Amino acid sequence: TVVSRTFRSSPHRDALQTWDAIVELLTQGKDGTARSELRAVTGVAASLIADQAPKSAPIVATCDGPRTRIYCLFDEDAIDGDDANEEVLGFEPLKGDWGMSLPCPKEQLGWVQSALKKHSSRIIARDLSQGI
């Protein structure tokens, strides 16, 4: 099972507000190590959102359960919101042996993958021209 969501980002939300909304979607109010790790990579994740990395390549969460693909909308699409889908997820999106794959322009992968590795082994980045 795979489900998708689409969040309104800049200029409706700034890049950090966008990540915070994604963290809430994926952690659902649970104060645990998963939420702590997602919050720990905020600088990197917001940087990638500000570069519109998730416009055409999703943030992908994997778990003991359905996969979640998260896209972001920018510019007029974010202002309009017609393509947005921010519904609550009908499952625990980071259950069990979870992971997250962040899209990243290939030229930034060097610094991004190192920056992520400081905080997590479950949150990784990929070249946004490829899937997981």
Torsional class of 4: left (φ above 0), alpha (ψ -120 to 50), beta (otherwise): beta
Give the per-residue contact string, 26-55, with Ca ion (x = CB under 5 A; - = no). Answer: -------------------------x----
Question: Which residue type occupies 106?
Answer: K
Binding of a second copy at residue 124 (CB under 8 A)? no
Q: How large is the angle between the packed helices 42-50 and 15-27, nearest 10 degrees?
A: 120
Residues that contact a second copy, how many (by CB under 8 A): 18
Q: What residues between 44 and 63 interact with a second copy by CB under 8 A? A: 44, 46-47, 50
Torsional class of 112: left (φ above 0), alpha (ψ -120 to 50), beta (otherwise): alpha
Q: Residues interacting with Ca ion, by CB under 5 A? A: 51
Q: Residues interacting with a second copy, by CB under 8 A? A: 14-17, 41-44, 46-47, 50, 107-108, 110-111, 114-115, 118
